[PDB]
C-alpha cells in the first residue's frame, strides 16, 4: 500500500441557516484559550447532548468504512448526521479548516482532511468528529479497520483503544492530570510502540480549545490538579514508528516521516465528584 499524497477536496457542504456557529467560522483565529476549565452545571448538562451527538456521528460515518469508499464520503455522512441533529461540525471554518471532520488514514497521525482518496482494503482510518450544539462542543474520535487488516495493525489500533480507557478510567479529583500521560505511555510501551507528544488532548467547554492542555507521554512536572467540573479530551495518537512528522502544505495533514501507520481514540471527558463520566457515549 503506497503512501497516501493530496486528494482532492469536495466543495464546502452547507450547513442550515438556523444552525448557530462558532464565533470563529470564517475568521482566521479563534477566541479561545482563556476560558474557564472547570464548567458551570449548565454547561456540563449542555455537553452530554453535545457529546452524545458527536458520538452518534462518529458511530455513523464509522459504518460506512470500507474498501471502496472516500474519505470525502466519510465526511459527507458524518455532516449530515450533526446538521441533521441540529449540530454545527466545529471543525468546518475553524482556522480555516474545510471540511467536518478529519479523516486520518494509515501514516495520518491527524487532521487529515476529507478528500478523493479512496480507501482500500488492510487500511485504518481515524474518524474525529466535533459537535457544537447549545453553545458547547463535545469531541471524539476512533480508528476504524477497513477489510482484511494487517495483524500488526489491528493490534495497534485494539491497544491504542485500551491505552484511552485505561487513561480514562484513572480520571478523578483530586488527582495530578499527569497521570493520564504516564498510564498511556507505560502501555504503550509495553508493545514497543511510540507516543506523539506534540499533539495533545484538551480542555473543551463553551470553546473548542480552552486553554488546557493534556499530554499523552509521561511528563511529571505538570502540576495540575483534576478537580470536580473540569471537561477534556483524552486523545492519544500512537506510532509503530519514529515520532518524527511532516505538515503537508495544506497546513493541516500530519504524516509519520517513516511512513509507519499511526492509530487514535478520544473521548470528552467529565471529571465528577468522584470519579469520570464519558460524554461521547451514544
Ligand atoms: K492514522
Redesign the pocket.
Known amino acids: 500500500r503506497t503512501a497516501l499524497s493530496p486528494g482532492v477536496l469536495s466543495p464546502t457542504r452547507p450547513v442550515p441557516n438556523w444552525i448557530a456557529r462558532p464565533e470563529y467560522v470564517g475568521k482566521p483565529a479563534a477566541q479561545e484559550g482563556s476560558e474557564p476549565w472547570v464548567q458551570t452545571p449548565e454547561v456540563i448538562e449542555k455537553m452530554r447532548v453535545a457529546g452524545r451527538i458527536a458520538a452518534g456521528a462518529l458511530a455513523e460515518a464509522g459504518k460506512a468504512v470500507a474498501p471502496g469508499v472516500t474519505t470525502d464520503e466519510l465526511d459527507r455522512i458524518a455532516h449530515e448526521y450533526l446538521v441533521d441533529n441540529g449540530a454545527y461540525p466545529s471543525t468546518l471554518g475553524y482556522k480555516g479548516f474545510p471540511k467536518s471532520c478529519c479523516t ?7 487532521h ?1 482532511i476529507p478528500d478523493s482518496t479512496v480507501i482500500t482494503d488492510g487500511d ?3 474518524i474525529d468528529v466535533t459537535a457544537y450544539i447549545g453553545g458547547v462542543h463535545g469531541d471524539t474520535n476512533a ?1 476504524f479497520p477497513a477489510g482484511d487488516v494487517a495483524d500488526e495493525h489491528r493490534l495497534l489500533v485494539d491497544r491504542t483503544r485500551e491505552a484511552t480507557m485505561r487513561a480514562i478510567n484513572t480520571v478523578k479529583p483530586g488527582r495530578a492530570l499527569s497521570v493520564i500521560g504516564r498510564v498511556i505511555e507505560s502501555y504503550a510501551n509495553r508493545f514497543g510502540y511510540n507516543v506523539v507528544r506534540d499533539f495533545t488532548g484538551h480542555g473543551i467547554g463553551t470553546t473548542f480549545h480552552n486553554g488546557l492542555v493534556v499530554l499523552h507521554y509521561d511528563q511529571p512536572a505538570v502540576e495540575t490538579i483534576m478537580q470536580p467540573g473540569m471537561t477534556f479530551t483524552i486523545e492519544p ?1 500512537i506510532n509503530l514508528g519514529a515520532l518524527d512528522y511532516e505538515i503537508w502544505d495544506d497546513g493541516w495533514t500530519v504524516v509519520t516521516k517513516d511512513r509507519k ?4 481514540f478520544e473521548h470528552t471527558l467529565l471529571v465528577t465528584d468522584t470519579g469520570v463520566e464519558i460524554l461521547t457515549c451514544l
Request: hydrophobic share 45%.
Open positions: 486520518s488514514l494509515n501514516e495520518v497521525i491527524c487529515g485504518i482510518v481515524n480508528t495518537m501507520w499511526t492509530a487514535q
